[PDB]
Amino acid sequence: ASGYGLNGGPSRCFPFWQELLACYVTNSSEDNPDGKNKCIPVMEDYYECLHHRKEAARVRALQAAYREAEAKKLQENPPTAGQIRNLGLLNKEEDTKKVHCA
Amino acid sequence: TPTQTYQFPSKTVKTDYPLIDNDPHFTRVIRYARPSDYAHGLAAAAAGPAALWLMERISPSQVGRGGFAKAMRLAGFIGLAGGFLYFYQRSILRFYGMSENAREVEMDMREMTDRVKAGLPLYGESRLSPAMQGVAARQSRYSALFFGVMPWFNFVNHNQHGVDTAKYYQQAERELEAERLAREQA
Amino acid sequence: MATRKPAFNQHVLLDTTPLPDSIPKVKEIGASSAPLLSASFFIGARCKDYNDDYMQCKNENPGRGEFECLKEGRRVTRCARSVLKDINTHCLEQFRAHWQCLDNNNQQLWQCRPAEWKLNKCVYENLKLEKVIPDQPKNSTPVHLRQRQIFAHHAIPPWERPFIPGQ
Amino acid sequence: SRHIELKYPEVFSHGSPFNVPAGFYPNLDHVIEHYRKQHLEEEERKAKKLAAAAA
Amino acid sequence: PSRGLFRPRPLLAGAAVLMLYGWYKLVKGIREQNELAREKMWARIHLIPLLQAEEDRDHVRRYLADQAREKGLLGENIKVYNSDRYVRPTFAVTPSKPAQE
Amino acid sequence: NITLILFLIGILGFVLNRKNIILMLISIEIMLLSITFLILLSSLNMDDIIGQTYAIYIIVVAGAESAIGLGILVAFYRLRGSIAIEY
Amino acid sequence: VGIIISSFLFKMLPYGVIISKNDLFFITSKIWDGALAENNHISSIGNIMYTNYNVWLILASFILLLAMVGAIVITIKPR
Amino acid sequence: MIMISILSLLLSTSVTLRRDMSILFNRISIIALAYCILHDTMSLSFISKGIGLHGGLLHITNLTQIFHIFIFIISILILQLTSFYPRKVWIPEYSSLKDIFFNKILYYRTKIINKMGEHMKIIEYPLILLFVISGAVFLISTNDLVSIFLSIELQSYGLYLLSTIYRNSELSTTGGLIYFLLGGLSSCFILLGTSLLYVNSGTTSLDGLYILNSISDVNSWYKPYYLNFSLLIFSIGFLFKVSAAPFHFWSPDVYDAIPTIVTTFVAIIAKISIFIFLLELVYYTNSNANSYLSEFSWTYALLISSLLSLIIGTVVGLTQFRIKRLLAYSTISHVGFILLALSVSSIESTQAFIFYLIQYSISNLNAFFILITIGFSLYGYVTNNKEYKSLLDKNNSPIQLISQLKGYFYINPLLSLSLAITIFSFVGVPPLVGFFAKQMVLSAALDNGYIFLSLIAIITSVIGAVYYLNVIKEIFFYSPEHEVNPVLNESDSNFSLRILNEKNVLIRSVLLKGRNIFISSPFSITISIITNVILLFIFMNKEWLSMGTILVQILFSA
Amino acid sequence: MSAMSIYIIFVSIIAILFLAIDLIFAPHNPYKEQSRSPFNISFFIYGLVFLLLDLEILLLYPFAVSEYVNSAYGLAAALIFIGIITIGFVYELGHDALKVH
Numbered sequence A: 001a002s003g004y005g006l007n008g009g010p011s012r013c014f015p016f017w018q019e020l021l022a023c024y025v026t027n028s029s030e031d032n033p034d035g036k037n038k039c040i041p042v043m044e045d046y047y048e049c050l051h052h053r054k055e056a057a058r059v060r061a062l063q064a065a066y067r068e069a070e071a072k073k074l075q076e077n078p079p080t081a082g083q084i085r086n087l088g089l090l091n092k093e094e095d096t097k098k099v100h101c102a
Numbered sequence B: 001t002p003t004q005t006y007q008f009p010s011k012t013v014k015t016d017y018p019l020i021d022n023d024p025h026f027t028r029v030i031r032y033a034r035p036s037d038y039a040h041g042l043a044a045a046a047a048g049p050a051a052l053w054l055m056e057r058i059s060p061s062q063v064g065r066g067g068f069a070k071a072m073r074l075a076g077f078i079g080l081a082g083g084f085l086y087f088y089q090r091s092i093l094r095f096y097g098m099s100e101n102a103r104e105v106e107m108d109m110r111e112m113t114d115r116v117k118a119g120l121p122l123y124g125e126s127r128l129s130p131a132m133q134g135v136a137a138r139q140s141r142y143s144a145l146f147f148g149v150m151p152w153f154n155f156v157n158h159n160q161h162g163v164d165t166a167k168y169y170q171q172a173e174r175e176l177e178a179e180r181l182a183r184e185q186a
Numbered sequence C: 001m002a003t004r005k006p007a008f009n010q011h012v013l014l015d016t017t018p019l020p021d022s023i024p025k026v027k028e029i030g031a032s033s034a035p036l037l038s039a040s041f042f043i044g045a046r047c048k049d050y051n052d053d054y055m056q057c058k059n060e061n062p063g064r065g066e067f068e069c070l071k072e073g074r075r076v077t078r079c080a081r082s083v084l085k086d087i088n089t090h091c092l093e094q095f096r097a098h099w100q101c102l103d104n105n106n107q108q109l110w111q112c113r114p115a116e117w118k119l120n121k122c123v124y125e126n127l128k129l130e131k132v133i134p135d136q137p138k139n140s141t142p143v144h145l146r147q148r149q150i151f152a153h154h155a156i157p158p159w160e161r162p163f164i165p166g167q
Numbered sequence D: 001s002r003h004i005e006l007k008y009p010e011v012f013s014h015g016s017p018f019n020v021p022a023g024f025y026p027n028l029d030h031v032i033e034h035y036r037k038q039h040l041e042e043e044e045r046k047a048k049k050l051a052a053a054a055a
Numbered sequence E: 001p002s003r004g005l006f007r008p009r010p011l012l013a014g015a016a017v018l019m020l021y022g023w024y025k026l027v028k029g030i031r032e033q034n035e036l037a038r039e040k041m042w043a044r045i046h047l048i049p050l051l052q053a054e055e056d057r058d059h060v061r062r063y064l065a066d067q068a069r070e071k072g073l074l075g076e077n078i079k080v081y082n083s084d085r086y087v088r089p090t091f092a093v094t095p096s097k098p099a100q101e
Numbered sequence F: 001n002i003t004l005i006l007f008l009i010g011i012l013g014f015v016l017n018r019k020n021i022i023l024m025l026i027s028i029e030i031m032l033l034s035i036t037f038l039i040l041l042s043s044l045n046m047d048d049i050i051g052q053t054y055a056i057y058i059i060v061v062a063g064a065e066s067a068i069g070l071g072i073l074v075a076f077y078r079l080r081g082s083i084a085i086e087y
Numbered sequence G: 001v002g003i004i005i006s007s008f009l010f011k012m013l014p015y016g017v018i019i020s021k022n023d024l025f026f027i028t029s030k031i032w033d034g035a036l037a038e039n040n041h042i043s044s045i046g047n048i049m050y051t052n053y054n055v056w057l058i059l060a061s062f063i064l065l066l067a068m069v070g071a072i073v074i075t076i077k078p079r
Numbered sequence H: 001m002i003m004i005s006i007l008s009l010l011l012s013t014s015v016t017l018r019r020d021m022s023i024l025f026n027r028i029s030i031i032a033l034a035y036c037i038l039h040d041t042m043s044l045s046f047i048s049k050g051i052g053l054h055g056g057l058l059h060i061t062n063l064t065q066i067f068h069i070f071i072f073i074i075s076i077l078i079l080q081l082t083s084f085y086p087r088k089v090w091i092p093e094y095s096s097l098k099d100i101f102f103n104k105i106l107y108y109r110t111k112i113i114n115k116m117g118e119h120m121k122i123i124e125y126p127l128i129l130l131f132v133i134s135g136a137v138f139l140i141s142t143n144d145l146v147s148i149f150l151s152i153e154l155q156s157y158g159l160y161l162l163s164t165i166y167r168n169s170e171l172s173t174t175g176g177l178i179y180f181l182l183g184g185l186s187s188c189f190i191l192l193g194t195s196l197l198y199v200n201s202g203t204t205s206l207d208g209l210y211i212l213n214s215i216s217d218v219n220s221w222y223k224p225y226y227l228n229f230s231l232l233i234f235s236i237g238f239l240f241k242v243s244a245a246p247f248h249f250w251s252p253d254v255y256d257a258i259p260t261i262v263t264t265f266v267a268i269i270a271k272i273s274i275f276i277f278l279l280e281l282v283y284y285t286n287s288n289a290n291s292y293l294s295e296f297s298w299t300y301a302l303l304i305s306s307l308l309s310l311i312i313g314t315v316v317g318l319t320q321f322r323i324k325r326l327l328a329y330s331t332i333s334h335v336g337f338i339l340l341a342l343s344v345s346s347i348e349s350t351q352a353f354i355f356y357l358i359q360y361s362i363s364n365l366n367a368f369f370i371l372i373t374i375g376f377s378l379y380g381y382v383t384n385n386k387e388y389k390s391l392l393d394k395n396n397s398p399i400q401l402i403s404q405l406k407g408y409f410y411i412n413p414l415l416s417l418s419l420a421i422t423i424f425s426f427v428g429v430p431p432l433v434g435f436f437a438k439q440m441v442l443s444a445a446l447d448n449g450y451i452f453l454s455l456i457a458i459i460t461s462v463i464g465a466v467y468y469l470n471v472i473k474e475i476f477f478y479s480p481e482h483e484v485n486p487v488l489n490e491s492d493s494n495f496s497l498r499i500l501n502e503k504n505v506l507i508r509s510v511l512l513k514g515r516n517i518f519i520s521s522p523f524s525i526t527i528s529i530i531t532n533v534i535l536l537f538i539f540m541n542k543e544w545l546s547m548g549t550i551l552v553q554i555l556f557s558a
Numbered sequence I: 001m002s003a004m005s006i007y008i009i010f011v012s013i014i015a016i017l018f019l020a021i022d023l024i025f026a027p028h029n030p031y032k033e034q035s036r037s038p039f040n041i042s043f044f045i046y047g048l049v050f051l052l053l054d055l056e057i058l059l060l061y062p063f064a065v066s067e068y069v070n071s072a073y074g075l076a077a078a079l080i081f082i083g084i085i086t087i088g089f090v091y092e093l094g095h096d097a098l099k100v101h
């Protein structure tokens, strides 16, 4: 929320904070009490940028479905790491095809 | 017209008189100061050493031979310090709108409109970066309201002064137009 | 993925999934770091408008510019591809001599002035393209056009002359 | 008050000016217009206050 | 047996002139370094759009693959941010084991 | 989790201390280290350099209290001759 | 004391401090516009330490100034 | 201006080692603080909930500048205690304008005025108060977590050094050691509280935390439980620093151990700055919608501290026989009243808080001033009581027992009646000012539904009035064990004073006895002005209470 | 592995080997066979003034590696920070706190 990051700036979550401050100042005043309610989603996006709890929850689930799906299907021939270190190289076109399985 | 007369978000303060500058330059504050400010500043300044002298005559300190002379120089420095801070604060409150500034609005309008028609930047040009000019402005805005604690002055030519600048360009337009027809009709 | 520098990275995750057919395709640039720096000023001499449109476009769409600015990115890679093709077709001998120098000089331009000067004279004569560093001081010779380079590891020979476009 | 007014609205001008990626900073022209309205309304309110009472 | 090699007047004069010469050479050098830095920056600026464009297609590619991988596995896409902004991934789904090697 | 463990250690230094007034100086510093380490690790997690700045100022104030504290302990020792509590 | 204090403070911490069987992995990629002139952290702290947040430097300088004058006054014999 | 004064006084003090120059460094400190009053007096020309200054790390409010002025005036009154000699010699022949301004008096003033007393020989004493004052006026103006922490330590560290400044006192060194050690553990709680705020919010700015709290107050993966938990730990540190029960055990020991001149400053200024900062934090952390966030309000700890402070302060004080321990416990029961009005966040309670704080800071100052003057008046008195020869640090605290004030009515009636008027104000007896303060805090709580707490306050006010009355019984109900020194009036023991005109020519020579020695006017006038304010408040109440009605109207406005 | 790690281990190993020669070869013998005085306040002052000046000089190191950006505004603030710390030094010089003269 400071706007200055570790590498010479800016900070990763600073855009969400300015989006949150913009929402509050421009929709909430003393005339209308519930204007701030348009800020509830924007604050969650900023709490989520800092802590990444909801994203972690999506990945833990999606990763559990992915592993339980690729642990039961038939495997023909898994590519060795050396094959996937020659992928996209100018003289190893045979290995790129195997990696791409095309 | 640069098409962005108000370019920076600024704090509006509830005061009693029109705001001229949220952060005037030091040279302008001295320039717009009234002769009453000079008397008030000098009057306060002398009050510090004079209080120490009067306090010496009535309740004597019983110090040794050179102590009072050292104390008077320290009271004298604090007199000139406090006296100039009080004098500079009296002039700045009229730019801030916190004191009767009717004369100063007239001076400012003249100076800035005569800058506009001279092709000059309204507030001058900084050797500092646009971003450092922003940082400086965010430090000296309404700063003299804090002299009782910490001293700060503006020595940076930036264009973040809290005011929409259309009025300056509008009067320059109406003043060049007033003189153009007169020059061509006679 | 996150722009944080990694501290304990031991594994790489690749993804063989291609782009969807709907996105128009592009052939990516195949020049390495040193050839790109040799031709960096030539690419900015010709591609500057397209390079500036792309950055201006992404700016006009905050948080949504990776998508929503694809066509412009494809225009920058085609224009940069056209400059790399042209140096190869005409300036190949001097071009390789320059970036192979930068290979052994920490990729520092001041270390390879003689090769750049001969490449500058080939490009300017063949592609009319000139190297301009913007906002350089006016009271002194341009640093890239100076006979002597103080921070150069090896002295520049006096007979090696800086290329001035027209003399 | 259930509304907070920023004591320092100049925080909207904060942010490192170096190594800025394109499209990183959000567009805040609507913030600028809200604070412009507020300055113009106080200028006018005061102008009514000391011109309609000084005659 | 006084000798001029250790007399203060020649020493201060000699030390002073050395400092001025070095301060002349420091002034010129840092001015050259700051102009070498200007050419290095402009060189990386002319390359930043081509390099960012190839990165941007890669970010579009993986995101559209992850969005599809989910729709085929979990039956739908779980929204993380209420905004439509592209947020660069913090975590990723990974295979259970690395390549044999 | 390391930051909370060390904060307990400094706190338990006060729990287990009836005689050492030196160990209360030490336990205050362990608590300052845990809080600075927490700010520092959360700063890397949010890409914020302002946490590193706040950590720096906590180190300066922490040293300044060490100077002010060990000076007062010296003033106390000059007249008492022991730093021991008669318990 | 150990059970009560730990059982309360732990919940208070953010997710990223307690982020560390399927397991999450932290993915990172490269950027070019944000790498033009990367600064070391000290250079980044320096960029803001003496300008934007200079009031903290002023208050800390006075804290060190107090620890200097005050520690000497309580310990040394004058003259 | 406070920072220009510190550096200038520091440079002058650095190049001197003369201990006779202390008198004049304290006088220049009074003059320096008067310029700060004149600068902050001009900074009141706007109506604003607050303006952020210096990058948003500071703020100015009408309440901030009003209470910067109050802090500087309270400091000026305390500074007099080291700017003027305790006793003077006065004769009707040297009492006119021509005499006081144009003539001069010559006599051996050293033993009469205590020229070389311990208080008149610390060169850096005026300097270190300025350092404490600086941290006080920064706390009031802090808009950032970091600035709060740096300001609170600036104030705390200087208070520790004040308590240890009498280095030859084995009581002052102990008290400062106790204070630094229990004060440092308090600082960890304040630092833990701010650290836990930044880690859960990403922000150090109070306004961002206020807006995060504002949006959360609506009647999912990120429920903001941290703000009320973080502020709770953050409140424990400040509760200790104002000595609210149960975090109170240090104050009776520390206030009793350090010299009486010092405890005047130590026991007043810290509570002024801490209570102002808390008020703004309580206001913008309020719940306008009763939800689960309101069930864990941090303000409950202040409501429990107030209840505990009312009981402990009045009940434990019953069996105190040492006067500074008694006044320490009396302060605890007074912050139970201050804490009750802070916890009820209502327009009426906030006005009651501003009055209770100012009037009590002024009245507790009179109690310290009277005590210091009573000790400096026993110079012409002798005692054979055995319980007084066994006392410790009799110069740092001349009056340590309530037994020493037995029969003071006979020794000095109006000084005794001034202390009577002050003490009855602490009880809350009308028409005295201290009544109107407690009245406003009882009416605020009653109107908001804090009836159970109000009944507990009036019960402890009876209990606390017991030990207040015991001090009065000592001064007026018994004859004095203190008797006039026989030698100071022997009819052969006279000191020659000479009267000299401008050019050092002997106008007159007078023969003077111990009867021609009196209290210095700086202490007699100060006591007189505050006793009158406590007594005549019901005729001069409009502008004092109107200022508070306006300050609270701006804070709650909109 | 990293050079820093292998370097620290090698320095650690050399230290072990030099130690081993002493234990292995040097002769060994089984036989391995109360006052109070005030300490000088000077020892405290040496560490006190070092600790404070070491922190202040440390706080200036970020300025030296960020001077191109700090520029004139940064210079001013860093000079105000230098002046406050200097005034404290003149105080220890003035009171001979180091008790060296």
Ligand SMILES: CCCCCCCCCCCCO[C@@H]1O[C@H](CO)[C@@H](O[C@H]2O[C@H](CO)[C@@H](O)[C@H](O)[C@H]2O)[C@H](O)[C@H]1O
Binding pocket: B090, B098, B099, B100, H041, H042, H044, H045, H066, H069, H070, H358, H544
């Ligand atoms: C029990 C009391 C506890 C609190 C103690 C502190 C109370 C302080 C009260 C001060 C009130 C403000 O007092 C104010 O001073 C300023 C000083 O310039 C003056 O105010 C005036 O100043 C300028 C001139 O400089 C005018 O142009 C401006 O219109 C006006 O604000 C008035 O004299 C008074 O309005």
Ligand SMILES: CCCCCCCCCCCCO[C@@H]1O[C@H](CO)[C@@H](O[C@H]2O[C@H](CO)[C@@H](O)[C@H](O)[C@H]2O)[C@H](O)[C@H]1O
Binding pocket: B014, B015, B016, H044, H045, H046, H047, H062, H540, H543, H544, H546, H547, H550
């Ligand atoms: C018993 C002790 C003696 C009485 C103690 C109280 C006396 C001083 C009370 C001063 C406070 C109320 O009095 C008033 O309040 C407002 C609050 O912003 C301030 O008023 C200030 O701002 C307003 C609004 O722009 C201006 O119109 C006014 O000229 C200016 O001085 C001043 O402070 C004072 O003019």
Ligand SMILES: CCCCCCCCCCCCO[C@@H]1O[C@H](CO)[C@@H](O[C@H]2O[C@H](CO)[C@@H](O)[C@H](O)[C@H]2O)[C@H](O)[C@H]1O
Binding pocket: H446, H447, H448, H449, H451
């Ligand atoms: C044997 C003696 C027993 C009683 C001794 C103590 C009682 C002394 C007098 C108590 C007076 C009764 O208490 C008083 O009643 C009125 C209404 O009736 C309350 O008025 C009301 O204020 C709030 C605010 O609207 C209401 O939500 C609430 O219904 C009610 O408390 C007062 O807040 C309360 O102060």
Ligand SMILES: CCCCCCCCCCCCO[C@@H]1O[C@H](CO)[C@@H](O[C@H]2O[C@H](CO)[C@@H](O)[C@H](O)[C@H]2O)[C@H](O)[C@H]1O
Binding pocket: I016, I019, I020, I023, I024, I025, I026, I027, I028, I029, I030
């Ligand atoms: C630091 C890395 C880990 C350690 C690596 C090296 C370990 C070396 C262990 C063996 C050291 C042998 O060293 C040898 O010890 C024996 C037993 O104490 C000594 O023996 C000595 O003491 C014994 C005690 O009973 C006597 O009886 C004997 O007469 C006397 O010589 C030898 O003089 C010494 O040379």
Ligand SMILES: CCCCCCCCCCCCO[C@@H]1O[C@H](CO)[C@@H](O[C@H]2O[C@H](CO)[C@@H](O)[C@H](O)[C@H]2O)[C@H](O)[C@H]1O
Binding pocket: G079, H014, H015, H016, H017, I086, I089, I090, I091, I093, I094, I095, I096, I101
């Ligand atoms: C940017 C660098 C600036 C450097 C500034 C230099 C500081 C100048 C001010 C401090 C020096 C003047 O302050 C002076 O210090 C000297 C040395 O201790 C003292 O010297 C005297 O007292 C001390 C203590 O009794 C004796 O040990 C000493 O023998 C005696 O001469 C003076 O009493 C003091 O007045």
